[PDB]
Amino acid sequence: DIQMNQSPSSLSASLGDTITITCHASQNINVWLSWYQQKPGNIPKLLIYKAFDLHTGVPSRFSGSGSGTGFTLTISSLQPEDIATYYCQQGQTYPFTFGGGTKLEIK
Amino acid sequence: MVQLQESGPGLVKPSQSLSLTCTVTGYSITSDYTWNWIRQFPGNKLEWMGYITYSDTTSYNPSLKSRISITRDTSKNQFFLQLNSVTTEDTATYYCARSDGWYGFAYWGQGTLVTVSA
Amino acid sequence: LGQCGLLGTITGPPQCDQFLEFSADLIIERREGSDVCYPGKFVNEEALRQILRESGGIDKESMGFTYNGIRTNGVTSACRRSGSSFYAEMKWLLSNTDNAAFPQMTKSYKNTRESPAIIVWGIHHSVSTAEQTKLYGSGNKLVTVGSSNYQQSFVPSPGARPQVNGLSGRIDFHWLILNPNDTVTFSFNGAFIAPDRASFLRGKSMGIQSGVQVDANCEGDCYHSGGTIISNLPFQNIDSRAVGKCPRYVKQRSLLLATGMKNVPELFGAIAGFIENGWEGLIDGW
Amino acid sequence: NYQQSFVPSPGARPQVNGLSGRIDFHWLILNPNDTVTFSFNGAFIAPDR
């Protein structure tokens, strides 16, 4: 079991700010993290696979980064539909694990 | 465009048998990707539980391997879990998926909220 | 590295995925280590395998290439993790649609660290002129790779080949070394396996070829294919290609020493001289 | 004892002292009473001595 401690659980920001958030996995998951967008009331959908690549169909201002143990997405130019819980997936070993999530609000 | 649909009745009493049944229209299961089922808690905590592949092999969650059977069918284009030894704690939403695995979890479905109660 | 082959750690084939950014004072590679997944080889690869065994790992950093009007999701059935996958560090570029063209492109990467990088790119040797017209497109194909100390202008060579694991195409992976504050410009109109994360050497290591199991209770220094040599002895008959701080290979199989006297049973002539004989009378000294 | 049939390889390169082109200088050795014929339609830096 490889635990994913997505910190912090809550953060609010304004429209056009930059936010930096950490999915910190317990062991070395070298490039295999796949991050997911949960709307409240709608299904999760993929945004970034292999820590680096945009699933074709999403607009471009998403940029996931980081590598190694600690990982980081950034959003510059926050938009009002960006209210979500951004879930992240460990993909080195079996079994798979997900994480606790985070809450992003319009302040 | 890929779209997949679940089916199933929405009630189960503890220690009974309630089946989950996913149908895929337009795309086959023999071309080589796996097929996971994903669990959704009240309080939107999530866990994975198992998958069937294109190649008829199974692998499950190591807290749950004594409970799960995954099999699949071709004329229906269907993959099949029946979960026994249930408990009222297992009230969840079960998402079937064309799960790519190491490329992530590519396609998802609408998901069905089923209830476990006495 | 087990089933990984040591040149795959900069390409990441589907068995080197737990290994892409390792860090070691002892790298170990096995007979079943296949450097690739898609069948092929690295050109000048023994120079490359001799960089990496004494490198202490590789500390990948991104090259910041972005790509446009182009698809980059190239996969093949021979590289399997859970589905049809590819390499972890490279990019099978292709066309946009299958038979229009490949638009001509040009990128460049400036080294900005202190250490020398290791670039590794790839040329794809297809099976025909019917698959490079559907992977990349019509026309000739050209991959110029230039720095301050280097240009080569590679080109593919299609044709029918014998199958190894189901496919009859190849990929050759070439490599250079950038120096601090250099550049490599890549121009290419197809048939190119672009890199995505260059590599920087971490430190020092050694490298051994073997086929035996790992034992972390034993403490040893001189390692060959059937194991590990450990003594203070200067000469070894065991294997000639013993690497590390190894003793010296020799042909003969025993050489000796003493402590003392040539023995008498009961360069001046003292051992059995005019004192012609021995003892067991005293028993401490001689 | 020799033929090679060289060809240039143009492209964009990093500047070293202001210019981004190169010249590669190759060399052979002639033996007594031999010849080298050079044919060339461009891109050639001929010798003179």
XYZ file of C-alpha atoms in Angstrom:
560
model
C 0.000 0.000 0.000
C 1.487 3.312 -1.144
C -0.239 6.245 0.548
C -1.017 9.562 -1.142
C -1.209 12.492 1.284
C -2.610 15.317 -0.829
C -1.978 18.545 1.093
C -3.769 20.752 1.794
C -7.351 19.569 2.095
C -8.693 23.101 1.541
C -7.579 26.276 -0.234
C -9.536 29.202 -1.667
C -8.275 31.811 -4.108
C -9.391 34.599 -6.418
C -9.862 34.677 -10.171
C -6.493 35.003 -11.901
C -4.284 33.937 -8.976
C -1.681 31.151 -9.027
C -2.114 28.113 -6.766
C 0.459 25.413 -5.995
C -0.626 22.142 -4.391
C 1.210 18.938 -3.500
C 0.415 15.289 -4.057
C 3.104 13.676 -1.936
C 3.355 9.907 -2.369
C 5.171 7.830 0.222
C 7.609 5.992 -2.081
C 9.212 6.484 -5.479
C 6.543 6.533 -8.217
C 8.993 7.895 -10.795
C 6.750 9.305 -13.564
C 3.517 7.390 -12.925
C 0.996 9.872 -11.512
C -2.348 10.551 -13.174
C -4.459 13.393 -11.885
C -8.244 13.686 -11.990
C -10.801 16.521 -11.872
C -13.870 15.911 -9.667
C -16.678 18.309 -10.132
C -19.118 18.219 -7.164
C -22.033 16.371 -8.732
C -20.250 15.274 -11.928
C -17.864 12.398 -12.656
C -14.054 12.628 -12.442
C -12.232 13.175 -15.737
C -8.581 12.849 -16.742
C -6.375 15.925 -17.200
C -2.726 14.737 -16.945
C -1.186 11.284 -17.476
C 2.445 10.172 -17.020
C 2.818 13.384 -14.894
C 3.448 15.439 -18.061
C 1.018 14.909 -20.947
C -2.288 16.638 -21.725
C -5.165 14.348 -22.660
C -6.222 15.863 -25.977
C -9.512 17.689 -25.554
C -8.685 19.829 -22.492
C -7.711 23.528 -22.847
C -4.049 24.394 -22.620
C -3.612 26.460 -19.422
C -3.300 23.305 -17.287
C 0.315 22.522 -16.484
C 1.230 19.647 -14.193
C 4.821 19.409 -13.031
C 7.101 17.963 -10.388
C 8.769 14.559 -10.315
C 10.203 12.102 -7.808
C 8.559 11.922 -4.384
C 6.743 15.283 -4.346
C 4.531 16.463 -7.213
C 2.769 19.715 -8.106
C 0.145 21.057 -10.464
C -0.217 24.796 -10.959
C -3.105 26.852 -12.274
C -2.398 30.366 -13.393
C -5.542 32.207 -14.579
C -8.166 30.493 -12.437
C -11.640 30.439 -14.008
C -15.023 29.950 -12.247
C -15.590 26.394 -13.512
C -12.296 25.296 -11.880
C -14.157 24.451 -8.626
C -13.187 20.822 -8.106
C -11.460 18.166 -6.029
C -8.230 17.280 -7.789
C -7.516 13.597 -7.181
C -4.155 11.999 -7.895
C -3.286 8.368 -8.695
C -0.298 6.231 -7.756
C 0.687 3.921 -10.584
C 3.953 2.163 -9.795
C 2.848 -0.982 -7.979
C -0.072 -3.159 -7.088
C -2.412 -2.305 -5.473
C -3.336 1.094 -6.862
C -4.112 3.888 -4.422
C -5.885 7.226 -4.612
C -5.667 10.169 -2.243
C -7.843 12.229 0.056
C -8.399 15.174 -2.269
C -8.559 18.947 -1.889
C -11.171 21.691 -1.970
C -10.845 24.718 -4.273
C -13.368 27.548 -3.947
C -14.054 30.963 -5.422
C -13.181 33.444 -2.692
C -17.093 8.379 -29.262
C -16.849 5.832 -26.463
C -19.730 5.737 -23.969
C -20.423 2.927 -21.484
C -23.559 2.225 -19.414
C -24.111 0.317 -16.159
C -27.172 -1.616 -15.030
C -28.310 -3.043 -11.714
C -31.004 -2.941 -9.030
C -30.495 -0.487 -6.214
C -31.140 -2.471 -3.017
C -29.162 -5.089 -1.091
C -29.525 -6.456 2.437
C -26.363 -7.483 4.381
C -24.778 -10.838 3.399
C -26.806 -10.983 0.146
C -25.746 -10.891 -3.494
C -26.089 -7.784 -5.662
C -24.493 -7.860 -9.109
C -22.911 -5.061 -11.125
C -23.136 -5.202 -14.900
C -21.495 -2.862 -17.425
C -22.233 -2.725 -21.160
C -19.974 -1.127 -23.775
C -21.466 0.046 -27.081
C -19.207 0.444 -30.104
C -15.890 -0.883 -28.808
C -14.738 -4.380 -27.970
C -12.968 -5.881 -24.975
C -10.574 -8.201 -26.843
C -8.330 -5.349 -28.054
C -5.673 -4.999 -25.445
C -6.658 -2.820 -22.465
C -7.861 -3.671 -18.949
C -11.278 -3.006 -17.387
C -11.375 -1.743 -13.776
C -14.231 -1.106 -11.354
C -13.864 1.851 -8.976
C -15.552 2.502 -5.604
C -16.953 5.839 -4.355
C -17.638 6.586 -0.694
C -19.953 8.984 1.150
C -17.423 11.745 1.706
C -15.923 11.104 -1.798
C -13.056 8.854 -0.724
C -12.169 6.402 -3.503
C -10.647 2.924 -3.814
C -10.040 0.522 -6.706
C -10.953 -3.126 -6.343
C -10.094 -5.187 -9.436
C -10.031 -5.611 -13.191
C -10.446 -8.064 -16.049
C -8.233 -7.689 -19.116
C -8.494 -8.501 -22.793
C -6.584 -11.704 -22.020
C -8.712 -13.318 -19.243
C -6.646 -12.658 -16.128
C -7.793 -11.259 -12.780
C -6.123 -9.272 -10.019
C -7.807 -7.734 -7.003
C -7.369 -5.511 -3.973
C -5.372 -7.380 -1.266
C -7.975 -6.607 1.409
C -10.822 -7.935 -0.748
C -9.600 -10.955 -2.742
C -11.816 -13.369 -0.796
C -14.945 -11.500 -1.929
C -14.626 -10.632 -5.633
C -15.144 -12.493 -8.882
C -14.662 -10.744 -12.218
C -15.654 -12.494 -15.456
C -16.787 -11.189 -18.808
C -19.013 -12.027 -21.764
C -18.767 -11.287 -25.478
C -22.248 -11.528 -27.050
C -23.498 -8.951 -24.542
C -20.069 -7.184 -24.589
C -20.198 -7.244 -20.804
C -17.957 -7.661 -17.753
C -19.342 -9.060 -14.572
C -18.792 -8.603 -10.838
C -20.931 -10.205 -8.160
C -20.020 -9.116 -4.638
C -20.887 -11.409 -1.730
C -20.475 -11.114 2.065
C -21.656 -7.515 1.904
C -22.069 -5.107 4.822
C -24.058 -1.872 5.343
C -20.716 0.034 5.307
C -20.327 -0.703 1.572
C -22.861 1.902 0.380
C -21.016 3.147 -2.665
C -21.096 4.184 -6.314
C -19.462 1.721 -8.705
C -17.812 3.118 -11.841
C -16.969 0.737 -14.668
C -14.255 2.001 -16.980
C -11.970 1.248 -19.901
C -8.977 1.708 -17.636
C -5.687 2.115 -19.436
C -3.691 1.418 -16.263
C -0.179 2.846 -16.530
C -1.601 5.485 -18.880
C -4.154 6.199 -16.157
C -7.913 5.736 -16.185
C -8.967 6.841 -19.639
C -12.739 6.410 -20.035
C -15.294 6.664 -17.228
C -19.041 6.252 -16.846
C -21.921 8.087 -15.212
C -21.869 5.753 -12.218
C -24.795 4.341 -10.277
C -25.526 5.161 -6.644
C -26.654 1.906 -5.032
C -27.695 1.659 -1.389
C -26.889 -1.017 1.207
C -29.319 -1.111 4.122
C -31.382 -3.182 6.518
C 18.392 -4.057 -13.240
C 17.141 -7.639 -13.644
C 15.151 -7.726 -16.848
C 15.983 -4.088 -17.591
C 18.901 -3.434 -19.860
C 21.237 -0.664 -18.782
C 20.730 1.378 -21.933
C 17.045 1.325 -21.361
C 17.254 3.506 -18.271
C 17.513 6.560 -20.548
C 14.763 5.302 -22.804
C 12.480 3.546 -20.344
C 11.148 0.435 -22.027
C 8.284 -1.241 -20.117
C 10.555 -3.237 -17.832
C 12.810 -0.324 -16.837
C 9.925 1.716 -15.382
C 11.041 1.206 -11.796
C 14.502 2.413 -12.795
C 14.245 5.667 -14.784
C 16.046 7.859 -12.278
C 18.061 5.481 -10.161
C 21.107 6.193 -8.033
C 23.674 3.539 -7.347
C 27.238 2.751 -6.371
C 26.791 -0.659 -8.056
C 24.745 -1.233 -11.204
C 23.940 -4.879 -12.094
C 22.612 -6.078 -15.448
C 21.455 -9.545 -16.461
C 21.616 -11.879 -19.459
C 17.857 -11.489 -19.930
C 18.247 -7.725 -19.888
C 16.818 -6.547 -23.190
C 17.755 -2.878 -23.644
C 14.705 -2.277 -25.816
C 11.115 -3.254 -26.260
C 10.642 -2.322 -29.884
C 13.375 -4.357 -31.610
C 16.546 -2.480 -32.400
C 19.862 -1.404 -30.984
C 21.914 1.618 -30.063
C 24.621 2.730 -32.473
C 28.054 3.080 -30.826
C 26.508 1.506 -27.802
C 29.583 0.247 -26.055
C 30.803 3.780 -25.625
C 27.378 4.547 -24.164
C 27.388 1.508 -21.884
C 30.769 2.628 -20.577
C 29.558 6.092 -19.679
C 26.731 4.760 -17.568
C 28.326 2.100 -15.410
C 30.588 4.648 -13.722
C 27.961 7.418 -13.537
C 26.257 6.916 -10.194
C 22.775 7.014 -11.649
C 21.074 9.506 -13.901
C 19.238 12.622 -12.819
C 16.757 13.309 -15.613
C 15.655 16.877 -16.297
C 13.069 18.045 -18.783
C 14.039 19.524 -22.128
C 10.945 21.627 -22.422
C 10.040 20.654 -25.948
C 6.490 21.331 -27.043
C 5.070 20.026 -30.295
C 2.450 21.410 -32.660
C 0.155 20.292 -35.484
C 1.375 16.808 -34.743
C 0.437 13.721 -32.765
C 2.755 12.288 -30.135
C 0.751 9.361 -28.702
C 2.590 6.707 -30.682
C 2.415 3.238 -29.145
C 3.120 -0.321 -30.223
C 1.885 -3.729 -29.120
C 5.397 -4.926 -28.215
C 5.761 -2.467 -25.329
C 3.263 -3.482 -22.653
C 2.582 -2.181 -19.159
C -1.201 -2.467 -19.055
C -2.002 -1.531 -22.638
C -0.246 -0.601 -25.852
C 2.398 1.732 -24.493
C 5.706 3.254 -25.515
C 8.978 4.438 -23.951
C 8.934 6.603 -20.849
C 11.496 9.172 -22.030
C 10.891 9.359 -25.756
C 8.247 10.426 -28.186
C 7.197 8.429 -31.219
C 6.089 11.369 -33.284
C 3.807 10.706 -36.221
C 1.680 12.605 -38.670
C -1.585 14.406 -37.966
C -3.626 12.392 -40.440
C -2.265 9.298 -42.008
C -1.383 10.229 -45.596
C -1.257 14.016 -45.932
C 2.288 14.834 -44.720
C 4.521 15.579 -41.742
C 5.144 19.330 -41.287
C 8.768 20.361 -41.003
C 9.847 21.283 -37.507
C 12.877 22.509 -35.557
C 13.641 22.533 -31.843
C 16.603 23.314 -29.636
C 17.657 22.777 -26.039
C 20.204 24.853 -24.175
C 22.144 23.162 -21.411
C 21.990 25.458 -18.409
C 23.515 23.389 -15.654
C 27.082 22.841 -14.569
C 27.337 19.185 -15.692
C 27.444 17.587 -19.152
C 24.148 16.164 -20.364
C 23.586 12.999 -22.373
C 21.189 13.416 -25.209
C 19.767 10.312 -26.849
C 17.419 10.510 -29.805
C 16.213 7.882 -32.238
C 15.776 7.197 -35.932
C 13.046 4.729 -36.906
C 13.934 2.178 -39.608
C 10.555 1.107 -40.926
C 9.738 -2.058 -42.837
C 8.956 -0.520 -46.214
C 8.147 2.570 -48.160
C 4.508 1.779 -47.404
C 4.820 2.363 -43.665
C 6.921 5.524 -43.657
C 4.295 6.924 -46.001
C 1.685 6.121 -43.366
C 3.615 6.855 -40.195
C 5.293 10.034 -41.385
C 4.549 10.620 -45.062
C 5.879 11.042 -48.593
C 9.270 12.413 -49.592
C 12.742 11.842 -48.241
C 13.500 11.846 -44.517
C 16.263 13.733 -42.742
C 17.334 14.166 -39.109
C 20.140 16.686 -38.583
C 21.628 16.727 -35.078
C 24.084 19.551 -34.406
C 25.981 21.197 -31.540
C 29.253 23.106 -31.277
C 31.332 19.919 -31.674
C 29.035 17.747 -33.720
C 26.769 17.311 -36.710
C 25.931 14.040 -38.473
C 22.752 14.345 -40.642
C 21.232 10.873 -40.192
C 18.665 9.244 -42.493
C 16.551 6.045 -42.165
C 17.011 2.861 -44.201
C 13.725 1.028 -44.791
C 13.447 -2.512 -46.124
C 12.263 -5.995 -45.254
C 13.949 -7.556 -42.222
C 13.605 -10.750 -40.181
C 11.015 -10.610 -37.400
C 12.149 -10.391 -33.807
C 9.086 -10.463 -31.536
C 6.479 -9.997 -34.251
C 7.743 -6.767 -35.822
C 10.111 -6.242 -38.739
C 11.088 -2.614 -38.117
C 13.944 -1.186 -36.120
C 14.896 1.887 -34.132
C 18.496 3.000 -33.819
C 19.240 5.217 -30.831
C 22.182 7.583 -31.216
C 23.676 9.816 -28.597
C 25.986 12.807 -28.075
C 27.182 14.783 -25.058
C 26.439 18.467 -24.543
C 28.839 20.649 -22.618
C 27.746 23.546 -20.347
C 25.899 26.402 -22.110
C 25.771 24.542 -25.433
C 22.787 23.698 -27.612
C 21.578 20.891 -29.811
C 19.263 21.941 -32.577
C 17.208 19.079 -33.991
C 15.569 19.578 -37.361
C 13.576 16.641 -38.664
C 10.830 15.902 -41.175
C 9.895 12.481 -39.856
C 11.273 9.130 -38.740
C 12.467 10.641 -35.494
C 12.133 9.397 -31.946
C 12.459 12.709 -30.030
C 13.638 12.792 -26.420
C 11.603 14.316 -23.640
C 13.931 14.193 -20.644
C 17.688 14.439 -21.043
C 19.991 12.946 -18.453
C 22.656 14.295 -16.163
C 25.109 12.117 -14.370
C 24.816 12.024 -10.616
C 28.108 10.785 -9.294
C 30.288 7.691 -9.324
C 29.533 3.990 -9.636
C 30.978 0.776 -10.990
C 29.328 -1.719 -13.265
C 29.246 -5.511 -13.332
C 27.748 -8.152 -15.608
C 26.476 -11.187 -13.742
C 23.872 -13.895 -13.397
C 23.734 -14.605 -9.648
C 21.573 -13.298 -6.798
C 22.047 -10.198 -4.614
C 23.337 -10.699 -1.057
C 23.437 -7.627 1.194
C 24.839 -9.452 4.231
C 28.139 -10.224 2.511
C 30.645 -7.364 2.104
C 32.644 -7.614 -1.126
C 34.529 -5.608 -3.725
C 35.608 -7.672 -6.790
C 32.672 -8.865 -8.855
C 32.433 -11.124 -11.918
C 29.700 -12.977 -13.814
C 29.420 -15.968 -11.497
C 29.534 -13.916 -8.371
C 32.016 -12.024 -6.252
C 35.674 -12.545 -5.451
C 36.741 -11.760 -1.895
C 40.193 -12.218 -0.496
C 43.443 -10.374 -0.060
C 45.070 -12.522 -2.728
C 46.684 -10.716 -5.667
C 45.990 -13.325 -8.335
C 42.751 -14.978 -9.437
C 42.076 -17.876 -11.843
C 38.345 -17.386 -11.678
C 37.532 -14.942 -14.445
C 39.694 -12.731 -16.648
C 37.155 -9.970 -17.114
C 36.769 -9.291 -13.371
C 35.897 -5.637 -12.735
C 36.140 -3.414 -9.697
C 39.154 -3.363 -7.444
C 39.884 -6.899 -8.625
C 42.995 -9.041 -8.343
C 44.964 -9.893 -11.431
C 44.039 -12.697 -13.812
C 46.592 -15.437 -14.271
C 46.801 -18.757 -16.136
C 48.140 -21.195 -13.559
C 45.967 -22.467 -10.722
C 48.235 -22.600 -7.656
C 51.200 -20.543 -6.363
C 52.596 -20.804 -2.855
C 54.651 -19.530 0.124
C 56.052 -20.896 3.400
C 56.848 -20.013 7.005
C 60.135 -21.825 7.516
C 62.306 -24.791 7.227
C 62.712 -27.321 4.527
C 62.058 -30.533 6.392
C 64.421 -33.349 7.366
C 62.884 -36.645 8.458
C 64.926 -38.586 11.013
C 73.421 -21.669 0.947
C 75.867 -22.517 3.591
C 74.496 -25.999 4.422
C 72.928 -25.648 7.870
C 69.706 -27.641 7.520
C 71.104 -31.198 7.939
C 74.779 -30.166 7.767
C 77.363 -31.403 10.247
C 74.504 -31.007 12.590
C 72.947 -33.546 10.248
C 69.675 -34.223 12.001
C 66.554 -32.900 13.659
C 64.356 -33.263 16.731
C 61.131 -33.599 18.381
C 62.990 -32.888 21.653
C 62.312 -29.186 22.080
C 58.788 -28.288 20.943
C 58.467 -24.483 21.203
C 60.910 -22.885 18.762
C 62.937 -24.466 16.020
C 43.165 2.745 -52.875
C 40.283 5.015 -52.023
C 36.893 6.437 -52.883
C 34.319 7.821 -50.440
C 31.700 10.040 -52.207
C 31.066 12.684 -49.530
C 28.009 14.953 -49.313
C 27.204 18.015 -47.125
C 24.639 18.121 -44.313
C 23.034 21.555 -43.942
C 20.919 22.631 -40.983
C 20.748 25.083 -38.112
C 23.624 24.859 -35.631
C 24.798 26.758 -32.549
C 26.988 29.785 -33.262
C 30.688 29.618 -32.544
C 32.252 33.011 -33.310
C 29.258 34.516 -35.087
C 28.718 31.892 -37.793
C 26.504 28.811 -37.791
C 28.094 26.887 -40.667
C 30.870 24.343 -40.634
C 33.637 22.980 -42.822
C 34.878 19.427 -42.454
C 38.370 18.797 -43.797
C 39.096 15.245 -44.920
C 42.383 13.832 -46.047
C 43.992 10.883 -47.855
C 47.545 9.929 -48.804
C 48.713 9.518 -52.390
C 51.501 7.119 -53.227
C 54.105 7.744 -55.980
C 52.698 8.016 -59.533
C 49.085 7.883 -58.334
C 46.239 10.303 -58.976
C 43.280 11.756 -57.157
C 40.423 12.789 -59.367
C 38.040 15.232 -57.705
C 34.614 15.678 -59.241
C 32.331 18.119 -57.472
C 29.237 20.201 -58.168
C 29.557 22.524 -55.198
C 30.144 22.673 -51.456
C 33.813 21.934 -51.947
C 36.863 23.571 -50.442
C 39.493 22.677 -53.093
C 43.189 22.520 -52.230
C 45.791 24.585 -54.006
C 49.077 23.292 -52.609
